[PDB]
Design a protein around this ligand. Structure first.
Ligand SMILES: [Mg+2]
Ligand SMILES: [Mg+2]
Ligand SMILES: [Mg+2]
Ligand SMILES: [Mg+2]
Ligand SMILES: [Mg+2]
Ligand SMILES: [Mg+2]
Ligand SMILES: [Mg+2]
Ligand SMILES: [Mg+2]
Ligand SMILES: [Mg+2]
Ligand SMILES: [Mg+2]
Ligand SMILES: [Mg+2]
Ligand SMILES: [Mg+2]
Ligand SMILES: [Mg+2]
Ligand SMILES: [Mg+2]
Ligand SMILES: [Mg+2]
Ligand SMILES: [Mg+2]
Ligand SMILES: [Mg+2]
Ligand SMILES: [Mg+2]
Ligand SMILES: [Mg+2]
Ligand SMILES: [Mg+2]
Ligand SMILES: [Mg+2]
Ligand SMILES: [Mg+2]
Ligand SMILES: [Mg+2]
Ligand SMILES: [Mg+2]
Ligand SMILES: [Mg+2]
Ligand SMILES: [Mg+2]
Ligand SMILES: [Mg+2]
Ligand SMILES: [Mg+2]
Ligand SMILES: [Mg+2]
Ligand SMILES: [Mg+2]
Ligand SMILES: [Mg+2]
Ligand SMILES: [Mg+2]
Ligand SMILES: [Mg+2]
Ligand SMILES: [Mg+2]
Ligand SMILES: [Mg+2]
Ligand SMILES: [Mg+2]
Ligand SMILES: [Mg+2]
Ligand SMILES: [Mg+2]
Ligand SMILES: [Mg+2]
Ligand SMILES: [Mg+2]
Ligand SMILES: [Mg+2]
Ligand SMILES: [Mg+2]
Ligand SMILES: [Mg+2]
Ligand SMILES: [Mg+2]
Ligand SMILES: [Mg+2]
Ligand SMILES: [Mg+2]
Ligand SMILES: [Mg+2]
Ligand SMILES: [Mg+2]
Ligand SMILES: [Mg+2]
Ligand SMILES: [Mg+2]
Ligand SMILES: [Mg+2]
Ligand SMILES: [Mg+2]
Ligand SMILES: [Mg+2]
Ligand SMILES: [Mg+2]
Ligand SMILES: [Mg+2]
Ligand SMILES: [Mg+2]
Ligand SMILES: [Mg+2]
Ligand SMILES: [Mg+2]
Ligand SMILES: [Mg+2]
Ligand SMILES: [Mg+2]
Ligand SMILES: [Mg+2]
Ligand SMILES: [Mg+2]
Ligand SMILES: [Mg+2]
Ligand SMILES: [Mg+2]
Ligand SMILES: [Mg+2]
Ligand SMILES: [Mg+2]
Ligand SMILES: [Mg+2]
Ligand SMILES: [Mg+2]
Ligand SMILES: [Mg+2]
Ligand SMILES: [Mg+2]
Ligand SMILES: [Mg+2]
Ligand SMILES: [Mg+2]
Ligand SMILES: [Mg+2]
Ligand SMILES: [Mg+2]
Ligand SMILES: [Mg+2]
Ligand SMILES: [Mg+2]
Ligand SMILES: [Mg+2]
Ligand SMILES: [Mg+2]
Ligand SMILES: [Mg+2]
Ligand SMILES: [Mg+2]
Ligand SMILES: [Mg+2]
Ligand SMILES: [Mg+2]
Ligand SMILES: [Mg+2]
Ligand SMILES: [Mg+2]
Ligand SMILES: [Mg+2]
Ligand SMILES: [Mg+2]
Ligand SMILES: [Mg+2]
Ligand SMILES: [Mg+2]
Ligand SMILES: [Mg+2]
Ligand SMILES: [Mg+2]
Ligand SMILES: [Mg+2]
Ligand SMILES: [Mg+2]
Ligand SMILES: [Mg+2]
Ligand SMILES: [Mg+2]
Ligand SMILES: [Mg+2]
Ligand SMILES: [Mg+2]
Ligand SMILES: [Mg+2]
Ligand SMILES: [Mg+2]
Ligand SMILES: [Mg+2]
Ligand SMILES: [Mg+2]
Ligand SMILES: [Mg+2]
Ligand SMILES: [Mg+2]
Ligand SMILES: [Mg+2]
Ligand SMILES: [Mg+2]
Ligand SMILES: [Mg+2]
Ligand SMILES: [Mg+2]
Ligand SMILES: [Mg+2]
Ligand SMILES: [Mg+2]
Ligand SMILES: [Mg+2]
Ligand SMILES: [Mg+2]
Ligand SMILES: [Mg+2]
Ligand SMILES: [Mg+2]
Ligand SMILES: [Mg+2]
Ligand SMILES: [Mg+2]
Ligand SMILES: [Mg+2]
Ligand SMILES: [Mg+2]
Ligand SMILES: [Mg+2]
Ligand SMILES: [Mg+2]
Ligand SMILES: [Mg+2]
Ligand SMILES: [Mg+2]
Ligand SMILES: [Mg+2]
Ligand SMILES: [Mg+2]
Ligand SMILES: [Mg+2]
Ligand SMILES: [Mg+2]
Ligand SMILES: [Mg+2]
Ligand SMILES: [Mg+2]
Ligand SMILES: [Mg+2]
Ligand SMILES: [Mg+2]
Ligand SMILES: [Mg+2]
Ligand SMILES: [Mg+2]
Ligand SMILES: [Mg+2]
Ligand SMILES: [Mg+2]
Ligand SMILES: [Mg+2]
Ligand SMILES: [Mg+2]
Ligand SMILES: [Mg+2]
Ligand SMILES: [Mg+2]
Ligand SMILES: [Mg+2]
Ligand SMILES: [Mg+2]
Ligand SMILES: [Mg+2]
Ligand SMILES: [Mg+2]
Ligand SMILES: [Mg+2]
Ligand SMILES: [Mg+2]
Ligand SMILES: [Mg+2]
Ligand SMILES: [Mg+2]
Ligand SMILES: [Mg+2]
Ligand SMILES: [Mg+2]
Ligand SMILES: [Mg+2]
Ligand SMILES: [Mg+2]
Ligand SMILES: [Mg+2]
Ligand SMILES: [Mg+2]
Ligand SMILES: [Mg+2]
Ligand SMILES: [Mg+2]
Ligand SMILES: [Mg+2]
Ligand SMILES: [Mg+2]
Ligand SMILES: [Mg+2]
Ligand SMILES: [Mg+2]
Ligand SMILES: [Mg+2]
Lengths: 272, 45
RNA sequence: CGCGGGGUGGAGCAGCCCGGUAGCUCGUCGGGCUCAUAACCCGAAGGUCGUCGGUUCAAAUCCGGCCCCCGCAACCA
RNA sequence: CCUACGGGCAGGCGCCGAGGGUAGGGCCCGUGACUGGGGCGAAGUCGUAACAAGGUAGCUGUACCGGAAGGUGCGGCUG
RNA sequence: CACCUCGAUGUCGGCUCGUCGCAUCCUGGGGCUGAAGAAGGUCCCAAGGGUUGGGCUGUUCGCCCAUUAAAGCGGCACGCG
RNA sequence: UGCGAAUGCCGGCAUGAGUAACGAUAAAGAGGGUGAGAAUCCCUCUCGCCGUAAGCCCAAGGGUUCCUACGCAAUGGUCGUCAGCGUAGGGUUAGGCGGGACCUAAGGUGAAGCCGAAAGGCGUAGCCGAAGGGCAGCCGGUUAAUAUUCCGGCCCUUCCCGCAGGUGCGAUGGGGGGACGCUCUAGGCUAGGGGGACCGGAGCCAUGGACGAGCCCGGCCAGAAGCGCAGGGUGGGAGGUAGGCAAAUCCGCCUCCCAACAAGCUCUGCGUGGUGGGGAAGCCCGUACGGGUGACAACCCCCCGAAGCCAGGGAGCCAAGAAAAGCCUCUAAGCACAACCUGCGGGAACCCGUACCGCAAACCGACACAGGUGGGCGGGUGCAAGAGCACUCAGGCGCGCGGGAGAACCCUCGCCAAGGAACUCUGCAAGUUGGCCCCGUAACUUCGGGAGAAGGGGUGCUCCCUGGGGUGAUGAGCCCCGGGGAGCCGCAGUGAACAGGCUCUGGCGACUGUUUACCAAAAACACAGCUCUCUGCGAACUCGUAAGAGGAGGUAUAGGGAGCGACGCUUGCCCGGUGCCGGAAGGUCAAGGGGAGGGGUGCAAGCCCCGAACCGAAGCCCCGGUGAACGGCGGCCGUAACUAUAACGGUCCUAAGGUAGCGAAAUUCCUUGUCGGGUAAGUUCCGACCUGCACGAAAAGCGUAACGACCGGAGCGCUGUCUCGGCGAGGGACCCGGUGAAAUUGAACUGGCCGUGAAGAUGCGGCCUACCCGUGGCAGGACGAAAAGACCCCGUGGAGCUUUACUGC
RNA sequence: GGCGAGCUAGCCCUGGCCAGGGUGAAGCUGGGGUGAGACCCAGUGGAGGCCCGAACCGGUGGGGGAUGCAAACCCCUCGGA
RNA sequence: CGUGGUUCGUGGAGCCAUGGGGGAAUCUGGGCGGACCACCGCCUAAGGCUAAGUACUCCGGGUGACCGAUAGCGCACCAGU
């Protein structure tokens, strides 16, 4: 549960590494169903469009299965739980009896031997995916679809969960990781349980270099700039914002709400 | 120290070459120019 | 030297703009309640308005000289 | 050099060695701009905390706050 | 004050090397003294030569330590890049 | 259409001037040859210099610079008979080496498709795209000049055809595979290297000795099958099947049965191998290079041993480590008198490159330029190791002006009596220290550190005794770690070379890191970490007119913006103003709706203009919240039984009047504040007071071990820093021969003083002084050169930057 | 309206390089310890924007150079490794 | 309603063109003569073709009170070298 280090070098002092005991006998993460060449590049055609990115360990993509209705009724055995450098979560490799293999984002407490299944049928046990509507009010769940058949998009980060607070008409009321209250169509497949590797929140990179392996380049405060290139920049020995704090592009960054108002999605939301 | 000219046969054709000049419309113009003027060489060698 | 504000009963302030009225709190004095003191209640006194002129019928008020007190400024060199 | 020489003495070298020097530690004492609380001291200032439901029962361990005594929160004791 | 210099007259102090003035800090010669002697005060003559080493500060300056016959003041583009 | 000026334009020729310089201080000397001519070209001998190179191979780039004959006008910083230069002729040989008739990567391009006023942009498949993947040649000889290319020896691949044998053959499709990190690392080998009394070899005995197990020299290279030694790879059989976008007998999954071993099968590496070939010193030849001999050369044992090979080996770890083809297997249409597989045999095997330079005189730097340039090899001895340092092999060089002289002065070095920071802005500089082994080592601390703390001792050689390991047989040898003892020598034993000065104490920043390419390396940026805020996913945000793309093939333990900056203890009060957030009411307001009413022209119908009320958004007003949002955080007067002082009070004002802590501070004006400390003496330094001109809590507050080419103070050590200089060395400076610049320049026959003058006179006045002309030196003057002053102002001149300046997008 | 990332900055794909020394984290094994533990001690092991130090990357102080060898150089010293 | 064109810069602003909205008629129908109405006249939109007179000079010729090698084209010459 998060390994510590003795201070035999500074930065090693408060540094902290993940615990890999949930990683079933695993290394080369089996080709076929993933990997897949991951085109890692920090911008688009030409220009940088997201700042302070680059470098970082080269990594094979693990093509995971984010829609499970693909295999209604066909159960599967949990073969392994392995490392995926593409998400905070860990991925379980599950063999189907169909003979087909695919990865799923590993729920918490999912043991390496369980039979798993998806469908209106499906016993309500950790690992099984079901259309929301057929899931008992109050059960936690993850990897939720937002619209039927469009693939799971909610609660996929390590530790993230989602409760089903109720039902109404064709929809069910979910409380999301954000704390938002969302009507979601009952036909949307979720999968019981909460993501997992939840100690993930408490790791401590420790050093500058560590943030770089993850491919995060240094981040420079506007403050440290000249007026040419950022709203806060210049005036001798620095100086308070001197205006309502803003992003390099001019817009205010403290409090100013940015969600588009007329979003049709609006009439299905109800919280923070 | 290290100066600005580091010759590279491939770079020079890939950049100022004839086939390169001919794609961009601005490039065709360069050629159209050097011809009008009568340049013995429309392109680096 | 520059610039701006200020000086009014014992203390701290208002009244100066917009001319003629001097006002508030505390303190002070006399009287009550108290064994007594404070608090509390009833009454009262006290200011020429920093000085010298000027304007005006009339100046704390408008004007100028000075006397003070406070603040700011003094940069390129 | 002396003999009563396969010796003695002188002399030479070496160990140890008082102490002297250089270096770094420890324990104790005295002293120091300034500084903390404490005791004592016929008639100083401020308030009223306690003793009588002390005029908000008191005390208590902890915690935050306050010119000061103290106040408040949490739990405990009844003395 | 704005006269030469803004098609450039490098701007403090230090170091080096000096040279001049005397309105003299010391030594030489004096008058007066409230000059007994010794030592001083004060003014006159005198520019020959001499006028220390340190601590503080970029400092010039100034303070201080230790001396000394004395620890002189100025000018030379606040002498001299 | 008339020139003397424009720091004018083009050109020519002067001055400085025979002046500076002739490009690393690695270094030269003589003899002989050639030639009109020789320090400079050829040869010999002697000397010196590189040797993880200044030697050798490869890739870029360069493009005749390559070899030979002839040649010296110019290029060569001198010379030139020489040359990389002029003329001419020669020279680059591949089925196996590199690249192409193979594969894919980023990226590019791009049928379909999408978007854009035109130009064009995006874009699935596909295609292009390599130092990555695939793939068959090793060694010797020969040329003046090429060679894995010619030859020689041994060996190999693909394609076509045929013969035989074998099988359902068949792919752009399916599957297996190719296939992948970092650090450490096992065994066995190889390159490589040292030794040998053994094997082979011309000769050598010098100068006192040595005819000797003497000295000197060499004792290998490539190589099929087969065989050995090491290692990698891999389960076999059967049955069920709904998955691997058709089908598979293949793969996947399930049950069962046998091996779990590498046994078997298979691949690679190493060894041995037929055969092929090389083969020193020395001496003889003649070079401008090489050649004959040595030779019928010999060709063997021992040891040290990789970072390389067996290779996909093993272990640990987190940051979790390309693709496609070749390849194998499976089947599909299709064909099965096909086709494919194995073996043999004959035939066929194309294009381009190949000279030379390649750490540099041939590449990038206008230059035969002290700079820059990727990969491999890089021997020996010694020093603890090593690619370090010294010397040296192979090889290559003395860097294309020289000769003398022995001044000042400069550069680079060496030493110095006594003193030892007195130097100075500062110990700047330089010195001291210095490797290994052992003894020993503080406060403090985050328990790791601080630590190489500090401070010490040992270090050579000779002989004797003696322990352990690797390889061998347990043995000798050889190689490696040592242990004890007695002695010898010097001023000195890491005897030369490479090799920390130390301590105390503050400031800033936690730390390693990053930065103004070329005046700033820092206390600045970044950094892990804290907080705020935005974003429910066609997310926010960014780029784009768009399509689209990044975000992300991510999903709130996630992503964007902002501030702060390890860690420790903490981060107070003010929401009045500005921002942001919430607020279905009300106030206001645009287009639009709406039309009461007015008007223009018509004989009229009508036609056509205006236009009230009223219903019409966001925004603003208004109403609340919000401080790790922009921000802010009082004044006067009095008061205690000495005095002062003020816990206490009075009053004015404010949105509220700065809490903890810190404080003459990177902040303190007054100021060298005052007191203490250090010093003989302290404007700085440390401690302290608070009178904070003008600290204060995430533009964070106060501390903090460790860390720092940061910045301040003190001491020890040691010194040419200094008192205060002296001597010495080498490279210049000087002289001689050769070559030969530059800024600058109105013209010159160019003195001092005191004056004057546009106010600082060689040039005017008066006087003074002074024969003509050079050379080595010094810098006071020519308001000396250089740059049309960067400061300052001026121009209704420019430009970057800002905002509650104006007006737009 | 065009030309430039053959210099320099960032990123992307694919290769390469970092002599030799030292310090000794986890884990492991053994011994101790307990009711079982924690934990302790050895030995082993070999972690780290760890240490010394060439290559390689740097540009700290100083001296020289200033019509330079050089339109950023040379020497000594120094940082990372 | 928003714009362009015309001398027309919102002006009394027509005419011609048209991005947006609404949206006819076919001879007694339509457009125009500078807001609008009347009167009076002019012309037949929403399809198209059409020589010549006009513009230019790479090129050829003829002329010159044009140049004469620092002129004249950048080039009198193996120069867009
Ligand atoms: Mg930052
Ligand atoms: Mg800045
Ligand atoms: Mg910019
Ligand atoms: Mg801005
Ligand atoms: Mg700002
Ligand atoms: Mg500031
Ligand atoms: Mg150039
Ligand atoms: Mg060129
Ligand atoms: Mg290339
Ligand atoms: Mg075209
Ligand atoms: Mg031609
Ligand atoms: Mg008063
Ligand atoms: Mg009263
Ligand atoms: Mg009374
Ligand atoms: Mg009066
Ligand atoms: Mg200014
Ligand atoms: Mg005391
Ligand atoms: Mg006391
Ligand atoms: Mg009480
Ligand atoms: Mg009481
Ligand atoms: Mg009580
Ligand atoms: Mg109070
Ligand atoms: Mg309590
Ligand atoms: Mg209680
Ligand atoms: Mg003037
Ligand atoms: Mg005047
Ligand atoms: Mg001049
Ligand atoms: Mg006199
Ligand atoms: Mg000083
Ligand atoms: Mg003087
Ligand atoms: Mg003056
Ligand atoms: Mg001066
Ligand atoms: Mg100077
Ligand atoms: Mg002339
Ligand atoms: Mg003239
Ligand atoms: Mg000529
Ligand atoms: Mg001269
Ligand atoms: Mg000379
Ligand atoms: Mg000379
Ligand atoms: Mg060479
Ligand atoms: Mg040639
Ligand atoms: Mg010749
Ligand atoms: Mg010649
Ligand atoms: Mg010559
Ligand atoms: Mg030359
Ligand atoms: Mg040649
Ligand atoms: Mg030639
Ligand atoms: Mg080759
Ligand atoms: Mg073909
Ligand atoms: Mg291809
Ligand atoms: Mg394109
Ligand atoms: Mg290709
Ligand atoms: Mg290849
Ligand atoms: Mg090949
Ligand atoms: Mg060969
Ligand atoms: Mg050759
Ligand atoms: Mg060998
Ligand atoms: Mg050998
Ligand atoms: Mg013989
Ligand atoms: Mg002899
Ligand atoms: Mg013999
Ligand atoms: Mg040998
Ligand atoms: Mg099996
Ligand atoms: Mg072999
Ligand atoms: Mg073999
Ligand atoms: Mg033979
Ligand atoms: Mg030779
Ligand atoms: Mg492995
Ligand atoms: Mg293909
Ligand atoms: Mg088959
Ligand atoms: Mg060749
Ligand atoms: Mg060659
Ligand atoms: Mg060469
Ligand atoms: Mg070569
Ligand atoms: Mg090289
Ligand atoms: Mg060159
Ligand atoms: Mg040369
Ligand atoms: Mg060179
Ligand atoms: Mg470089
Ligand atoms: Mg030795
Ligand atoms: Mg060594
Ligand atoms: Mg070396
Ligand atoms: Mg040598
Ligand atoms: Mg040699
Ligand atoms: Mg030379
Ligand atoms: Mg000395
Ligand atoms: Mg001495
Ligand atoms: Mg001493
Ligand atoms: Mg001093
Ligand atoms: Mg001094
Ligand atoms: Mg120094
Ligand atoms: Mg040294
Ligand atoms: Mg320390
Ligand atoms: Mg010896
Ligand atoms: Mg042995
Ligand atoms: Mg050292
Ligand atoms: Mg060091
Ligand atoms: Mg730092
Ligand atoms: Mg740099
Ligand atoms: Mg710089
Ligand atoms: Mg997207
Ligand atoms: Mg993506
Ligand atoms: Mg900061
Ligand atoms: Mg705060
Ligand atoms: Mg507020
Ligand atoms: Mg408010
Ligand atoms: Mg507000
Ligand atoms: Mg408001
Ligand atoms: Mg008393
Ligand atoms: Mg301050
Ligand atoms: Mg003292
Ligand atoms: Mg200072
Ligand atoms: Mg303050
Ligand atoms: Mg501050
Ligand atoms: Mg703040
Ligand atoms: Mg800070
Ligand atoms: Mg501090
Ligand atoms: Mg650093
Ligand atoms: Mg530093
Ligand atoms: Mg000296
Ligand atoms: Mg003369
Ligand atoms: Mg004069
Ligand atoms: Mg005259
Ligand atoms: Mg004269
Ligand atoms: Mg002279
Ligand atoms: Mg001079
Ligand atoms: Mg000179
Ligand atoms: Mg000048
Ligand atoms: Mg000017
Ligand atoms: Mg202007
Ligand atoms: Mg580049
Ligand atoms: Mg390190
Ligand atoms: Mg370090
Ligand atoms: Mg290091
Ligand atoms: Mg290397
Ligand atoms: Mg330097
Ligand atoms: Mg620098
Ligand atoms: Mg330097
Ligand atoms: Mg320098
Ligand atoms: Mg060093
Ligand atoms: Mg270094
Ligand atoms: Mg107008
Ligand atoms: Mg329309
Ligand atoms: Mg009509
Ligand atoms: Mg008309
Ligand atoms: Mg009309
Ligand atoms: Mg008409
Ligand atoms: Mg019509
Ligand atoms: Mg018509
Ligand atoms: Mg026409
Ligand atoms: Mg013509
Ligand atoms: Mg003529
Ligand atoms: Mg001519
Ligand atoms: Mg001409
Ligand atoms: Mg022409
Ligand atoms: Mg011309
Ligand atoms: Mg021509």
């Amino acid at each position: 549960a998060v390994k510590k280090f003795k201070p035999y070098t500074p930065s090693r002092r408060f540094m902290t590494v993940a615990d890999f005991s949930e990683i079933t006998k695993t290394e080369p993460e089996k080709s076929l169903v993933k990997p897949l060449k991951k085109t890692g590049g920090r911008n688009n055609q030409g220009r940088i469009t997201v700042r302070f990115r680059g470098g970082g360990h080269k990594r094979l993509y693990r093509i995971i299965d984010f829609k499970r209705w693909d295999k209604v009724g066909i159960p599967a055995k949990v073969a392994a739980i392995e490392y995926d450098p593409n998400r905070s979560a860990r991925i379980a490799l599950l063999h189907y009896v169909d003979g087909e293999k695919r990865y799923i984002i590993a729920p918490d407490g999912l043991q390496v031997g369980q039979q798993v299944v998806a469908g209106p049928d499906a016993p309500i046990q950790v690992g099984n995916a079901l259309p929301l509507r057929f899931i008992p009010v109050g059960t936690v769940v993850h990897a939720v679809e937002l619209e039927p058949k469009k693939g799971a998009k909610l609660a996929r980060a390590a530790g993230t969960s989602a409760q089903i607070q109720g039902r109404e008409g064709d929809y069910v009321i979910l409380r999301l990781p954000s704390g938002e209250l969302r009507k979601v169509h009952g036909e949307c497949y979720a999968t019981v349980g909460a993501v997992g590797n939840a100690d993930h929140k408490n790791i401590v990179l420790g050093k500058a270099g560590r943030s770089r392996w993850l491919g995060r380049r240094p981040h420079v405060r506007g403050a440290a700039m000249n007026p040419v290139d950022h709203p806060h920049g210049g005036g001798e020995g620095r100086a308070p914002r001197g205006r309502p704090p803003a992003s390099p592009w001019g817009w205010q960054t403290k409090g100013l709400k940015t969600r588009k108002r007329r979003k049709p999605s609006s009439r299905f939301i109800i919280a923070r | 120290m290290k100066r600005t000219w580091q010759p590279n046969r491939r770079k020079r054709a890939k950049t100022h070459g004839f086939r390169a000049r001919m794609r961009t419309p601005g490039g065709r113009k360069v050629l159209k120019r050097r011809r009008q003027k009568g340049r013995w060489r429309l392109t680096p060698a």
